[PDB]
Design a protein around this ligand. Sequence first.
Ligand SMILES: [Fe+3]
Ligand SMILES: [Fe+3]
Ligand SMILES: [Fe+3]
Ligand SMILES: [Fe+3]
Lengths: 437, 437
Amino acid sequence: RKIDPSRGATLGDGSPNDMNRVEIGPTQLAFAEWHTARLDLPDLAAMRRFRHRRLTDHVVARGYAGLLMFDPLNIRYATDSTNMQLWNTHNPFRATLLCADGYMVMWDYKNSPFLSEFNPLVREQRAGADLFYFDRGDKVDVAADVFANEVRILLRDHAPGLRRLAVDKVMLHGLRALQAQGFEIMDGEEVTEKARSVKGPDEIRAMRCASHACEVAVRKMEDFARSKVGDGVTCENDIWAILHSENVRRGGEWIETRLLASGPRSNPWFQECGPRVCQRNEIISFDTDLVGAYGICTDISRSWWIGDQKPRADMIYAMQHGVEHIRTNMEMLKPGVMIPELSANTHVLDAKFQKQKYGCLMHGVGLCDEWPLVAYPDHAVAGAYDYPLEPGMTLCVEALISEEGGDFSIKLEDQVLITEDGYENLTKYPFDPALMG
Amino acid sequence: RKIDPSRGATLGDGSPNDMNRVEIGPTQLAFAEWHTARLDLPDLAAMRRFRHRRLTDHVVARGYAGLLMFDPLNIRYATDSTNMQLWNTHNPFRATLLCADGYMVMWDYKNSPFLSEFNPLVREQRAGADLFYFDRGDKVDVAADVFANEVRILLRDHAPGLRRLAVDKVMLHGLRALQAQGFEIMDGEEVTEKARSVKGPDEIRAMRCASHACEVAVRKMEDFARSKVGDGVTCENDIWAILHSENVRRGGEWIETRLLASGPRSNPWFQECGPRVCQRNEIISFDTDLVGAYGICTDISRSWWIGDQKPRADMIYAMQHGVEHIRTNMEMLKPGVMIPELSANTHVLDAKFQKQKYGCLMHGVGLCDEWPLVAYPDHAVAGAYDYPLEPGMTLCVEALISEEGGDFSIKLEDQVLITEDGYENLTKYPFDPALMG
Ligand SMILES: [Fe+3]
Ligand SMILES: [Fe+3]
Ligand SMILES: [Fe+3]
Ligand SMILES: [Fe+3]
């Protein structure tokens, strides 16, 4: 029983053409829409090999024994295997070890070792890396020592004579157990963030797919908003719910924030989506901050005017100003440009917008928001991000246009790829023609 | 402009009756359904005071200076303030300090100090507790020292002469900075898990509300499944999407797992919801694992038979066996019973079910899955959970009924409150009458 009977043993992305397979991934709906958009599918095996080769190279360039990962998103990067991802972000039951020779082990939940079997780069599946109070009570230490010894033995074999173990984040008991085995603990996030920083050819294809799925879901949310707002019952949550459903229907995973806000609730920014019944002749501003198809994040922001009357002239000005902000900064994007050059040379927002502008003008994106962060010059920390842009980096370009004490904020954001010769904006979503004038 | 014009300055839960308020919470839809079910609303101010008094008492009983929390769910428990919760679970930008005298400080995202203002128990709002590589690059240490000094100064004033600082989870750089200020770092999760372990009168009311909202959302998912399955397009994700939407429409927050599985994909258990097109005459088994209204978790599980033909006799047997398992174990619930007594005296699953049974027979629940864990005797760790049940504890009672190499699994789960005299099952959701026979 096939997911695509109109194909052989595999899907166009190399995954098993079997409706009864363990693996999840995009839905028929999403595949259909991408075929129509004529988007090349990612070869998942190749994508996974690329990530593992790159991550392994990073461990070796640093002279480390290995990299031990407890962050679910780092685990995803290294193995592409999901397991109760959201539960995992705050209950650290999983671990992945990447040894300097490329050898990779997964400690998974005790009763689900099969979840990472589809990726033969994961050489072993074990249990017992769960070193928190909920899972072990007053008996975490015994287990911490068992686990740490396992790590020691693995790296004696796969990284003989190396003492430095990068760890992304670990529970205190785990840290001390690892130290008691003789490991010098290094910052794992500097390793993973820099590895994640450059996408390979299949990661690009994947992001193209995810981005499209996200945009279709956003359009569905817009359709619903423009059709319901004014009925005196449809709230911010009702609208936002369309983005949740339509992301899931395309094989998406979750939404990182609650950044949808209507009317006066959009200034100051960062107020959360909730029960406010929306109204005609108001701006709705939102940011997708979305983990979608193939586990790829689409992080884009738009502001919408729903109403028959024209918007106030300051709304139109703010909108056009955000668009100019994004498009100007985007033009700076080229390989070899340093991050702080981007900080220095940012397009300058008007005075009434400086105080409440966004925490950065750009940031990385992959499986979620990622390194680097490109802060505005008045916040840039010297020596913090002294690195060049490289081809394959994918960044979100931001604009928050928010008057101090103001009535509304414009939030705009596009997702862009760095190429050999410059950049390529991956976002196709239109700007609201009424807010653009 | 009021959220409930049919009321004064406040909602029935004490929150501001203003559609333009910063605070989120349940929707008109959810409030309507709870009024009809005649459910008393939680007094939020009182709920928040109860949690703070209890958490503070725990810090003091231990002789600690304070408790520093970076886990978003612990922050929620202490302050009830949300901010990009899911982003926060894996990018630690927030911190809450609870001093031994009750004094409480929030370090929030640099541009959103207002988010915790609605809770005057949060005495200060600062920034700069964000000590990870994405937010700070190669300059985390400078900031780690600034933050750690702030903590030192606060506890000199609010906990003079005390050196022990419980921390739930912290980044390595933060840990060393705190140690360099002279703090003895203790396990924060033993503090928070034990505080969270007992709910007050308003937390109970809140959970009653959340549980109802979750059940209505599940019914909506059932309606949709029973009406669409067989159409040859409706997949696991399509069905699951109804739970996402309908939780959000009631002010819910997120779903911790992907535990919905159709047909043969339900054995082994822990396979994830995905693109498999569902079919008539198959079991769908699922677990809500849901963070709903008022931020309260409803964690329940059901199995459904959709089809005109009767289910196989082993499915009916498995179902009845799970129900017996849950109802028998539930009968053990009383204050003063020790956790390992529950382990020892569990109802015994049949032989064909022992190998693949669930990781526990019971666990705590509050803002998510919580301490304690009640493991089956063949996994129980002696001395790990030597504690009595107390009134106000709220536990989920589990049954996974899964034949080794089998065709399907039955997953059932109810959420229960411990009372003075025994227990009270809070779950009202029916069992599938076709699977019950
Ligand atoms: Fe964003
Ligand atoms: Fe962004
Ligand atoms: Fe559950
Ligand atoms: Fe459970």
